[PDB]
Structure formats: structure tokens, C-alpha cells
Nucleic acid binder design. Structure first.
Ligand SMILES: [Mg+2]
Ligand SMILES: [Zn+2]
Length: 208
RNA sequence: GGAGGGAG
RNA sequence: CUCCCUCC
């Protein structure tokens, strides 16, 4: 009937903010979290340099906790004030019949089809782990200030020894670094959404 | 159950 | 840690 949790004022603000997108530009999307219970969400257009990055709190904290140690290293403490509903809102604003590019389209497909957008055409570059990540450290370097949200230490099976430490999976960096791979190098970036749209400024209060 | 991949 | 895909 309506769009949950967002008032009309900020919902129009959003819709205007997302008209800054070129419907026909190359458009990247990655997520952190399960498609059922996503936590981080990024969309990227290298052509303009503009991106949509925001956050959601997990409903399953158990599944979230494993995912953080072996994938994203996100501290649930840092999702503390995030716009409820934002995901459904942003997905709904995406242009009818859009073309998204991603890696491992199966997660992205599951999410969009759960938002009712079957109309969105998905292009999976279908790379390999070692190909796609080839621009990782440079992307993380030039672009570090854009995500401070992966605090955690992320690990991997060492063939000899069990845990080997790595660089975690940020929807945003992945978006950027996959483009770099598919375009053979690095492409200035601007957020489509205002900070107080993706995060509530929490105020001091008396507890009741 | 194995072989390989991919995702969080 | 957990999910997905392909193959026998
Ligand atoms: Mg992905
Ligand atoms: Zn991130």
C-alpha cells in the first residue's frame, strides 16, 4: 500500500536523488549479507562516478556473525542507526527494466526477485575469485575513506595452517574493483544519497 | 561421497 | 564457519 518506515518528505528526497542515475549507463551492484538478510548495499556507475552505498541491520545475527569473520568483517554495533525500509525503497526506485552488472549474479537475482523486480536484466561477468580481485589493494588504496565500516578481521582456510588473514568484502569496493578488472584499470566518485539519509544522527536521551 | 568453481 | 552451481 505504501513504503515502510520512510516518510513522504525523505521518500521524495530519495526518489529525486535516484533520478541522478543514468538509466542506460553500465551499472554495478554488489551486496554484503545474504540476499534474504542483506547488510551492505552498493550500486556504481563508472561513467558518471556516482554511487549508491548504504546499510541495513541483520535479522539473523547468528548467520551474520559467521559471515563477518569469513567475509565482510562488519561489526553489528556500527549498523546501529540505519534507515529501516531503505533497501526496499531504493530497489523500488530503480528504473523499470534496468541492466545491472555483477559478479555471482545468484545473490543479486534472489534479492531483486524478492523485491518484485524480475524486470531487471542481470549481466554476470562470471569471473573467478582471482581475476575479479586483481585490483583490490589499489582500489582499497585510492578509495579507502569511502568505507570505514569493515572493522573486523577476516580469515580464510590456509591449506597448511587453518586461518590466513585477508582483505574483506565491501559491496562498494567490489563494485569499483570489478569495473577496474573488466575495464583494465582505475577510472571522481560522488554519493547519490545524503549521509543523514543512510544514517540517523542519534541524539543523547534519557532511558525509558 | 568425491572433483572443480563461485558467493556471504 | 555457512550457502550456491557444475560434474562423476
Ligand atoms: Mg557478489
Ligand atoms: Zn563497505
Amino acid at each position: 500500500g505504501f513504503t515502510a518506515g520512510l516518510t513522504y518528505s525523505q521518500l521524495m528526497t530519495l526518489k529525486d536523488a535516484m533520478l541522478q542515475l543514468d538509466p542506460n549507463a553500465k551499472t554495478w551492484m554488489d551486496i554484503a549479507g545474504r540476499p534474504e538478510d542483506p547488510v551492505e548495499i552498493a550500486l556504481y556507475q563508472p561513467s558518471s562516478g556516482c554511487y549508491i552505498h548504504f546499510f541495513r541491520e541483520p535479522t539473523d545475527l547468528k548467520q551474520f556473525k559467521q559471515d563477518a569473520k569469513y567475509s565482510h568483517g562488519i561489526d553489528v554495533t556500527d549498523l546501529f542507526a540505519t534507515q529501516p525500509g531503505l533497501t526496499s525503497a531504493v530497489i523500488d526506485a530503480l528504473p523499470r527494466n534496468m541492466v545491472i552488472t555483477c559478479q555471482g549474479s545468484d545473490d543479486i537475482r534472489k534479492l531483486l526477485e524478492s523485491q518484485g523486480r524480475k524486470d531487471i536484466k542481470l549481466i554476470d561477468i562470471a569471473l573467478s575469485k582471482t581475476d575479479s580481485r586483481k585490483y583490490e589493494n589499489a582500489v582499497w588504496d585510492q578509495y579507502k575513506d569511502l568505507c570505514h565500516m569493515h572493522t573486523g578481521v577476516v580469515v580464510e582456510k590456509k591449506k597448511r595452517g587453518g586461518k590466513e588473514e585477508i582483505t574483506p568484502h565491501c559491496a562498494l569496493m567490489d563494485c569499483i574493483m570489478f569495473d577496474a578488472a573488466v575495464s583494465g584499470g582505475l577510472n571522481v566518485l560522488r554519493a547519490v544519497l545524503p549521509r543523514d539519509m543512510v544514517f540517523r544522527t542519534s541524539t543523547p536521551r534519557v532511558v525509558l
